[model samples]
Target: SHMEQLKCCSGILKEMFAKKHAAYAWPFYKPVDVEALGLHDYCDIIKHPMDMSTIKSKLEAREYRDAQEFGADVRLMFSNCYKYNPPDHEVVAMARKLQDVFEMRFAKM
Candidate 1:
């Protein structure tokens, strides 16, 4: 299941999260604002990568309702990503890799 990949990647992404980093990558790469999204917390969004159902609910409420990544604007499921450090190519690859994994996995099913 895709959750396995997301679950495992969360560890690799642990260092990428922050109060300053942007979890979502598009539309200005803004940091997650729980109040603005009317969500309970962004902490769980980061900590529980395997819990896709919960994250999906939060994303849905904010209008990222599509099941597919692109259609849903999956970036809205922001989980404190690495948008603070200088933008290195490798860093960019790592970020893209995460999204790619999700896209490919979802597409397969």
Candidate 2:
């Protein structure tokens, strides 16, 4: 089902940020070139549960640094909203993905 895919995909994005430091503002020299490099198709396989069509509208609305950092911030809202304190019954299902939640959001950093 699409919902299952969405749940898995959301976690994939979470794992992506765990080891990545890419930013959302990746540069774009040749949008066509990015696809030519197989990056577009590669990313296609890593679908997210959010709406990025609007984000992908402009040439400047692309990822940077292997798109890792770019991905780190993509679904930040969901992560930020639910990662720390998972909801009681998951109105939308919390993405409290990794164990670093307390070490990061609730930690003294």
Candidate 3:
């Protein structure tokens, strides 16, 4: 029943993105607009870009074998934020808060 368990956890992931920490969730919902923002070296700095929307796509496609895999992408999204943005940046602060919330809720799940 591992598939069933993954399905259930996937629901939790969806719920977490939709409702939990909704205030700080918006910025992470989609991929960053590097070209528009003129972040020329963004791709150079962040080799692996992750986002909630991409995670949601992966979840829907059932690409993750387990919750741990799911959690990795979520953490990746936050980590990417931290890597690209400065420590004092509001987005970095949001990522920190949201990452804490995600870790707490994910552990409970």
In model 1, the runs with Cα more than 4 Å from the true position are: 1-57, 60-62, 68-72, 75-88
lDDT of 2 by residue, 1-109 (tens): 4333334433443433443422321211112233555544434433332222322332144333333343444444344334333366342242333323322432221
Q: For candidate 1, give the lDDT of residue 67.
A: 43
Residue 95 in candidate 3, Cα distance off native in Å:
0.4
Candidate No. with top lDDT: 3
- For all predicted structures, in order, the TM-scores are 0.31, 0.26, 0.88
lDDT of 1 by residue, 1-109 (tens): 5444444333323323333334432322334455886757545645523223444344435432234432233443322344332467454555565566455545554
Best-first order by TM-score: 3, 1, 2
Highest TM-score: give the candidate number: 3
- Candidate 1 similarity to native, TM-score: 0.31
Instruction: Give the per-residue lDDT digits (tens) of candidate 3, residues 22-98.
Output: 88888988899999889998999999999888888898888988888888889888888888888899999888888
lDDT of 2: 0.34
Residue 69 accuracy (lDDT) in model 1: 39
Candidate 3: worst-modelled 10 consecutive residues by lDDT = 7-16
lDDT of 3: 0.82
Model 2 poorest 10 in a row by lDDT: 23-32
